[PDB]
Every structure is written in structure tokens, then in C-alpha cells.
Design an enzyme around this catalytic site. Structure first.
Site, mmCIF file in Angstrom:
data_model
loop_
_atom_site.group_PDB
_atom_site.id
_atom_site.type_symbol
_atom_site.label_atom_id
_atom_site.label_comp_id
_atom_site.label_asym_id
_atom_site.label_seq_id
_atom_site.Cartn_x
_atom_site.Cartn_y
_atom_site.Cartn_z
ATOM 1 N N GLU A 94 65.313 14.655 33.200
ATOM 2 C CA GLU A 94 65.686 14.902 34.751
ATOM 3 C C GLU A 94 66.179 16.181 35.018
ATOM 4 O OE1 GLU A 94 64.850 13.376 37.601
ATOM 5 O OE2 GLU A 94 63.450 12.135 36.066
ATOM 6 N N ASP A 113 59.820 17.513 29.426
ATOM 7 C CA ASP A 113 59.827 17.134 27.977
ATOM 8 C C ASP A 113 60.005 18.058 26.944
ATOM 9 O OD1 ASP A 113 59.081 14.422 28.737
ATOM 10 O OD2 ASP A 113 57.068 14.466 28.244
HETATM 11 ZN ZN LIG Z 1 59.234 13.689 34.904
#
Ligand SMILES: [Zn+2]
Length: 392
Positions: A94, A113
Site C-alpha cells: 500500500e 510488489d
Molecule cells: Zn495493489
């Protein structure tokens, strides 16, 4: 839009969020989540704003962010997270959506990621927690009648899991132990804020009870918490006793010992225990617990002494303002009560009501007093805030 315009819109929506029943305002949980979040933020690049992390009572796993570094996490995240590094991987993901200024596209998910796993690693968490967490999400989706909600927002194709495995595999092994606070937070979340599939089940407690020492203690804490909530206060005290003996300055245990004592009208015992706590002066959780005990023990002035200072130093904490209102009510200091409630309403975006209450407070206070000047100036500020939120 500018960064200042992003802050403004963000503040409007934070206030609407605080006006909602699902927001979890527990002092221990709020402090844990923001401490963990700030740890991650301190190891991230391109941070241009303060971050704030919110926990909402929702048994569907999800997480999202909105303008001004405001990250919202569903409480179901504690149910899915087996260890602290897994919880952190979602928060890092986030944060990375925010720092990169980004449902989301395949490219945005991959970037979040990749950046997120680096923040995880720099913050001292296990990089393998990220793919392990994602694999868990895909495994649940693969045999359920519907996917976890979070996958609607953050799509998880196989290529994304494979990429994440590869990144983690390329970093050096880093096996890490979850902090005791992780397990206590998880116990508290699932046990006190239980809802639907968010439950502190006997199976989780039995698994922990045969785990590492931190898990063992969190299970016992979990059992004490559940006894407390079923009106078994003697059982709760007894279950808590060895925990508090082994860690007499643990705030989770002091918090629960306070509630046990208050539930049996032992306000003085609870006050004395808290007055002896070493971190009383710096830990907001212990300050609020002490104020609450003073109130329950019919010493509202002592509570107000704590809470005037607390609210001044923690102005966005709606617990402080609520307890301040209660203390002032019990002193029959009714202008100060009205003003405390006004601030509660203003934090929840109900600015009309905040202004109404402050105007009452001002009208029934001495004309041209310092106090009246303070209320009138606060009314000014709220009207002006109302004007800038008008467009929304
Ligand atoms: Zn995401």
C-alpha cells in the site's frame, strides 16, 4: 492537483471515515498499527507526505489508500496474517502504491510488489512473507466460490505470484521472529472486534499454546480477554496474573488488568497499578487507562488533569476528547464539556454540530474572558474549514 490540495481532500475523507461505525479506535491497536506503519515508511523512498494507518472492522480482507498518505486496512488482515512480516507485506504494498502515485493495472501491481518487498527487507522483515501471503490468497480463491475482496482491487494473476517468488528468492535468507505485539494485536483484534469470520477460535489459541513463547503468552492473553468479555472477571484476573508477573510493564497486560479491576469496582487498585507504571508519562495507552480509572473511581478532576494535556498533545484522538467530555460533565463544567464534544464532532466531519456546541459554550461563559476568546477563535477556524470543504 498540488500536494496541498491532496492533503485537503485527504483530510475531508479522513473525517468522513472517522464518522463511520466500522472504524476501530482501540488505543492499543491504533498504536501498534501506526508504529508498524511508521517503521515501514522510515525505510521507503519518495515519501512526500505524512502517512496515517487506519483499521476498520470488516471480515473481508482488503486494503486501500486515498489522498494524503491515508492507508486503510480491514481487520480481516489479522486473520490472514500468520506472522508480522506477512501483515507488513500488505502495508508495504500500500505504501508503495502511494509513493509511486498510482482496481489497479497489472503494471501497478508488479511495481508495488517490487518496491514493497525492498521496503519490507530494509525494515527487517522476511521478504518470503510476501509471496507466501499471496500464495495463501490464491489458494483460498482457487477453491472458494468467490475470490477474497482484495483481489478485486489488487488483481493477482499467476505471473504476479511468480514474479514475487523470484524477487524474494533472489534476496538472502532472512528468517525473522514476529514481535509479541503482533500476536497480542491479533488476539485483541479477533477477540474484542470479532465479526463474522473474524473470530478468536479455540483452534487458533491451541495452536499458539503449543507454539513459541510469544505465541504461548498471546494465547493466554486471548483467553483472559475472552473471559473478561463473558463476565468471568475472576477467571480473567487469574489467567492474566502470570502474564503481568512476567512482564509487569507490558501495556497490553496493564490495559487488560485495568478493565478487569474496573469491571469489579476496584478503581483504586487499577489507579495504583497505573501510577506505578514506568512509562506512564510517555505511553498514551497508559494515560487513557488512568483517566478512565479516575472517572470510574469518581475522581473526575484527576481525570481532567490528564485529559486536558492529552487532548492538547493528541488532537486527532477521539478517545481523548470523549473522555474529556465525560470528566467535565462529571465536574458540571458544562462549557468545557460542550467544547470537548465539539472537537469530537469536528474530527468526524460534522462541522455544523461542532460549531453549534462551541457557540453554546461561548454564550454561557464570561463576556470578554480568555476562555470565551478561545472558543470564538475555534468557531472561526471551523467555519473557514467548512468553506474549503464546500466543493465536496
Ligand atoms: Zn495493489
Amino acid at each position: 492537483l498540488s500536494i496541498g490540495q491532496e492533503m485537503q481532500m485527504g483530510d475531508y475523507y479522513v473525517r468522513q471515515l472517522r464518522g463511520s461505525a466500522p472504524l476501530i479506535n482501540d488505543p492499543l491497536l491504533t498504536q501498534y498499527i501506526n508504529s508498524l506503519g511508521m517503521r515501514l515508511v522510515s525505510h521507503a523512498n519518495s515519501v512526500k507526505t505524512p502517512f496515517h494507518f487506519f483499521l476498520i472492522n470488516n471480515d473481508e480482507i482488503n486494503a486501500f489508500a486515498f489522498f494524503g498518505g491515508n492507508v486503510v486496512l480491514h481487520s480481516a488482515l489479522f486473520r490472514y496474517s500468520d506472522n508480522e512480516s506477512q501483515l507488513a507485506s500488505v502495508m508495504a504494498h500500500e505504501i508503495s502504491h502511494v509513493t509511486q502515485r498510482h482496481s489497479f493495472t497489472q503494471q501497478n501491481e508488479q511495481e508495488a510488489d517490487r518496491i514493497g518487498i525492498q521496503v519490507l527487507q530494509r525494515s527487517g522483515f522476511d521478504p518470503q512473507a510476501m509471496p507466501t501471503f499471496l500464495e495463501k490468497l490464491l489458494d483460498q480463491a482457487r477453491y472458494s466460490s468467490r475470490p477474497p475482496e482484495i483481489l478485486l482491487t489488487h488483481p493477482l494473476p499467476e505471473s504476479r505470484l511468480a514474479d514475487a517468488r523470484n524477487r524474494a528468492n533472489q534476496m538472502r535468507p532472512m528468517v525473522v521472529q514476529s514481535s509479541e505485539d503482533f500476536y497480542l494485536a491479533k488476539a485483541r483484534t479477533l477477540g474484542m472486534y470479532n465479526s463474522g469470520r473474524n473470530q478468536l477460535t479455540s483452534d487458533l489459541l491451541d495452536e499458539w499454546a503449543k507454539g513459541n513463547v510469544r505465541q504461548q503468552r498471546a494465547a493466554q492473553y486471548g483467553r483472559a480477554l475472552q473471559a473478561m468479555e463473558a463476565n468471568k472477571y475472576d477467571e480473567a484476573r487469574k489467567t492474566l496474573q502470570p502474564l503481568l508477573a512476567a512482564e509487569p510493564g507490558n501495556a497490553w497486560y496493564l490495559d487488560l488488568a485495568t478493565d478487569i479491576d474496573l469491571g469489579q469496582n476496584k478503581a483504586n487498585e487499577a489507579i495504583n497499578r497505573l501510577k506505578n507504571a514506568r512509562d506512564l508519562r510517555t505511553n498514551p495507552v497508559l494515560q487513557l487507562n488512568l483517566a478512565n480509572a479516575y472517572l470510574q473511581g469518581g475522581q473526575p478532576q484527576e481525570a481532567a488533569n490528564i485529559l486536558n494535556r492529552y487532548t492538547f498533545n493528541n488532537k486527532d484522538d477521539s478517545n481523548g476528547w470523549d473522555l474529556l467530555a465525560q470528566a467535565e460533565a462529571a465536574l458540571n463544567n458544562r462549557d468545557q464539556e460542550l467544547a470537548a464534544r465539539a472537537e469530537g464532532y469536528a474530527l468526524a466531519g460534522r462541522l455544523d454540530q461542532a460549531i453549534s456546541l462551541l457557540s453554546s459554550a461561548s454564550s454561557q461563559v464570561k463576556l470578554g474572558s480568555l476562555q470565551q476568546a478561545r472558543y470564538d477563535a475555534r468557531i472561526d477556524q471551523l467555519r473557514q474549514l467548512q468553506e474549503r470543504f464546500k466543493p465536496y
